[PDB]
Design an enzyme around this catalytic site. Structure first.
Site, PDB file in Angstrom:
ATOM      1  NE  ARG A  12     -71.781 -28.987 -32.933  1.00  0.00           N
ATOM      2  CZ  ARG A  12     -72.937 -28.976 -33.595  1.00  0.00           C
ATOM      3  NH1 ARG A  12     -72.957 -29.059 -34.919  1.00  0.00           N
ATOM      4  NH2 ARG A  12     -74.086 -28.892 -32.924  1.00  0.00           N
ATOM      5  CB  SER A 100     -76.815 -25.845 -30.814  1.00  0.00           C
ATOM      6  OG  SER A 100     -77.832 -26.835 -30.756  1.00  0.00           O
ATOM      7  CG  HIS A 101     -77.924 -29.429 -27.641  1.00  0.00           C
ATOM      8  ND1 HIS A 101     -77.680 -29.646 -28.982  1.00  0.00           N
ATOM      9  CD2 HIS A 101     -77.311 -30.438 -26.981  1.00  0.00           C
ATOM     10  CE1 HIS A 101     -76.955 -30.741 -29.125  1.00  0.00           C
ATOM     11  NE2 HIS A 101     -76.716 -31.240 -27.926  1.00  0.00           N
ATOM     12  CE  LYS A 110     -77.145 -24.523 -35.205  1.00  0.00           C
ATOM     13  NZ  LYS A 110     -78.452 -24.948 -34.639  1.00  0.00           N
ATOM     14  CG  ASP A 234     -82.299 -26.056 -29.214  1.00  0.00           C
ATOM     15  OD1 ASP A 234     -83.026 -25.125 -29.632  1.00  0.00           O
ATOM     16  OD2 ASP A 234     -81.355 -26.514 -29.894  1.00  0.00           O
ATOM     17  CG  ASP A 236     -79.980 -22.789 -31.379  1.00  0.00           C
ATOM     18  OD1 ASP A 236     -80.389 -23.796 -30.764  1.00  0.00           O
ATOM     19  OD2 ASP A 236     -79.484 -22.869 -32.522  1.00  0.00           O
ATOM     20  CG  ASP A 238     -82.153 -24.893 -33.869  1.00  0.00           C
ATOM     21  OD1 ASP A 238     -82.082 -25.367 -32.716  1.00  0.00           O
ATOM     22  OD2 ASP A 238     -81.164 -24.847 -34.616  1.00  0.00           O
ATOM     23  NE  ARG A 239     -82.137 -29.713 -29.954  1.00  0.00           N
ATOM     24  CZ  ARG A 239     -81.535 -30.659 -29.242  1.00  0.00           C
ATOM     25  NH1 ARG A 239     -81.281 -31.853 -29.774  1.00  0.00           N
ATOM     26  NH2 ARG A 239     -81.185 -30.407 -27.991  1.00  0.00           N
ATOM     27  CG  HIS A 321     -83.242 -29.485 -35.556  1.00  0.00           C
ATOM     28  ND1 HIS A 321     -82.745 -28.202 -35.638  1.00  0.00           N
ATOM     29  CD2 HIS A 321     -82.386 -30.167 -34.760  1.00  0.00           C
ATOM     30  CE1 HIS A 321     -81.654 -28.103 -34.901  1.00  0.00           C
ATOM     31  NE2 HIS A 321     -81.412 -29.282 -34.356  1.00  0.00           N
TER      32      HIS A 321
HETATM   33  O1  LIG Z   1     -74.756 -35.799 -33.643  1.00  0.00           O
HETATM   34  P1  LIG Z   1     -75.707 -35.972 -34.814  1.00  0.00           P
HETATM   35  O2  LIG Z   1     -76.667 -37.112 -34.565  1.00  0.00           O
HETATM   36  O3  LIG Z   1     -74.927 -36.164 -36.087  1.00  0.00           O
HETATM   37  O4  LIG Z   1     -76.577 -34.628 -35.009  1.00  0.00           O
HETATM   38  C1  LIG Z   1     -77.368 -34.084 -33.947  1.00  0.00           C
HETATM   39  O5  LIG Z   1     -77.232 -32.654 -33.938  1.00  0.00           O
HETATM   40  C2  LIG Z   1     -77.752 -32.026 -35.125  1.00  0.00           C
HETATM   41  C3  LIG Z   1     -79.233 -32.340 -35.361  1.00  0.00           C
HETATM   42  O6  LIG Z   1     -79.624 -31.714 -36.579  1.00  0.00           O
HETATM   43  C4  LIG Z   1     -79.422 -33.861 -35.399  1.00  0.00           C
HETATM   44  O7  LIG Z   1     -80.785 -34.253 -35.555  1.00  0.00           O
HETATM   45  C5  LIG Z   1     -78.857 -34.438 -34.096  1.00  0.00           C
HETATM   46  O8  LIG Z   1     -79.068 -35.847 -34.041  1.00  0.00           O
HETATM   47 ZN   LIG Z   2     -80.672 -25.634 -31.536  1.00  0.00          ZN
END
Ligand SMILES: O=P(O)(O)O[C@H]1OC[C@@H](O)[C@H](O)[C@H]1O
Ligand SMILES: [Zn+2]
Length: 455
Positions: A12, A100-101, A110, A234, A236, A238-239, A321
């Site tokens: 990312r 992603s978001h 990914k 979100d 993409d 996946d959420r 997710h």
């Molecule tokens: O910043 P992190 O907490 O490590 O990961 C986040 O981004 C990735 C998702 O899979 C997690 O559930 C979300 O909490």
């Molecule tokens: Zn996502």
């Protein structure tokens, strides 16, 4: 290439800064090389609806082609549709180009290679291939594949809604707009679209359903339109985020209670995975229905690996997710999860507010984030794991430190996406919530008296 873009769960970066077209090419070369090393020449490639998508995806594909890979280009799709492609096409490798978001300028990758979602040392191995020029060379090929109709049909045929529902769907101008409102309608709903035009400028709100502020418009529309449910995706897809007919936010750990009941009902003894950010109430609930609750590390890639390890039929993260293996493929998918939810809700004569309020609840904190340094966050956690004292409770150090007490729990862990410590607290009374917060505040201070304690 910059090392900072190579993270625990995926790659990312920011386009024009840490991510460029050239970067995408060499990442393509590295992924192709690894896929070939695992005996897999066939790789699917998808991208979300971001502004930088077209430029970077072309280079990602060329990098794969220049290894000798046979690429299946599925165009602009939600992340789970890419994962789907990597389960139903010839190859078991796939790359999704997505931010992603995150804000408009962010993008990333990914990666699934020969069935396995890469994480940790495997992502570093890609970085290492490029540094070492340990890269395959060959004359590959690209084929265009129109996968969305197959995905759509596969879900529609698996889902049986019992009665009509009216549903507000907020896509946040992300890529879920290509399928979610259409598919949910096809299941047997009336759909009120919100921000369902794909627009990489994200002119309305960030496509991040984990933050209540991003659900404000959804909540208001549900109420104004007398809808049965609100759903948000979100960027993409996946959420997923969920709102009841009365506008109550249903956090993903409580969503998982409903799903766990459903899955275990047909699969006695099934393992059900949840991350360290989820309510302790999940443990009791899964156990009560005769499932095996498995607490694991936060992070979509890490949850996916654990699924494989355990044979779990369902997993969820507090971030939203949700991973169905039962009747599905085991990858995270907000769109499929939305469909599974609508199926269950449609079979209950009660409204969605009452279906969810029936489950026990604790008092939960909003997430606490403490900014530290990227190069100190893991050391703080290590320090706590070495030195901290928590009193009487069940201590778990699989990801940070989580302590489960008789009447509540607390968590501190390092984020793998941002330079922050993440904390969560929940208890069945305000008094217990404060007692646990005090324990954690004092343990953080004992490691470093200079640390902020904004709780
Ligand atoms: O910043 P992190 O907490 O490590 O990961 C986040 O981004 C990735 C998702 O899979 C997690 O559930 C979300 O909490
Ligand atoms: Zn996502």
């Amino acid at each position: 290439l910059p090392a900072s873009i190579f993270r625990a769960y995926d790659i990312r970066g920011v386009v024009g800064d840490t991510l460029t077209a050239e970067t995408a090419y060499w990442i393509g070369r590295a992924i192709g090389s690894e896929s070939l090393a695992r005996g897999e020449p066939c790789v699917a490639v998808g991208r979300d609806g971001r502004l930088s998508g077209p430029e970077l995806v072309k280079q990602l594909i060329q990098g794969l082609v220049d290894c000798g890979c046979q690429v299946s280009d599925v165009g602009m799709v939600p992340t789970p549709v890419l994962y789907y492609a990597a389960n139903v096409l010839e190859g078991k490798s796939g790359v999704m180009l997505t931010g992603s978001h995150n804000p408009p300028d962010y993008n990333g990758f990914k990666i699934v290679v020969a069935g396995e979602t890469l994480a940790n040392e495997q992502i570093q191995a890609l970085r290492e291939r490029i540094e070492k020029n340990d890269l395959a060379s060959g004359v590959g090929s690209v084929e265009q594949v129109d996968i969305l109709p197959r995905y759509f049909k596969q879900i529609r045929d698996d889902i049986a809604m019992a009665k009509p529902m009216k549903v507000v769907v907020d896509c946040g101008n992300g890529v879920a707009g290509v399928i979610a409102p259409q598919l949910i309608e096809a299941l047997g709903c009336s759909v009120i679209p919100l921000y369902c035009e794909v627009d990489g400028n994200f002119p309305n709100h960030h496509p991040d359903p984990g933050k209540p502020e991003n659900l404000k418009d959804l909540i208001a529309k549900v109420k104004a339109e007398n809808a049965d449910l609100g759903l948000a995706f979100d960027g993409d897809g996946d959420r997923v985020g969920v709102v009841t007919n009365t506008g109550t936010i249903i956090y993903p750990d409580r969503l998982l209670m409903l799903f766990a009941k459903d899955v275990v009902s047909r699969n006695p003894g099934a393992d059900i995975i949840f991350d360290v950010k989820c309510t302790r109430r999940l443990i009791a609930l899964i156990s009560g229905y005769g499932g095996r609750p498995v607490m694991w590390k936060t992070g979509h890639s890490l949850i996916k690996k654990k699924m494989k390890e355990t044979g779990a039929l369902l997993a969820g993260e507090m971030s939203g997710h949700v991973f169905f293996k039962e009747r599905w493929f085991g990858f995270d998918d907000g769109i499929y999860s939305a469909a599974r939810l609508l199926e269950i809700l449609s079979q209950d004569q009660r409204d969605s507010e009452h279906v969810f309020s029936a489950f026990p609840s604790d008092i939960s904190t909003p997430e606490i984030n403490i900014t530290v340094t990227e190069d100190s966050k893991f050391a703080i956690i290590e320090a706590l794991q070495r030195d901290a004292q928590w009193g009487e409770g069940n201590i778990t150090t699989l990801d940070g430190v989580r302590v489960d007490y008789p009447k509540g729990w607390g968590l501190v862990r390092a984020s793998n996406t941002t330079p922050v410590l993440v904390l969560r607290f929940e208890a069945d009374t305000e008094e217990e919530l404060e007692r646990i917060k005090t324990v954690f505040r004092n343990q953080l201070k004992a490691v470093d008296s200079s640390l902020p304690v904004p709780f």
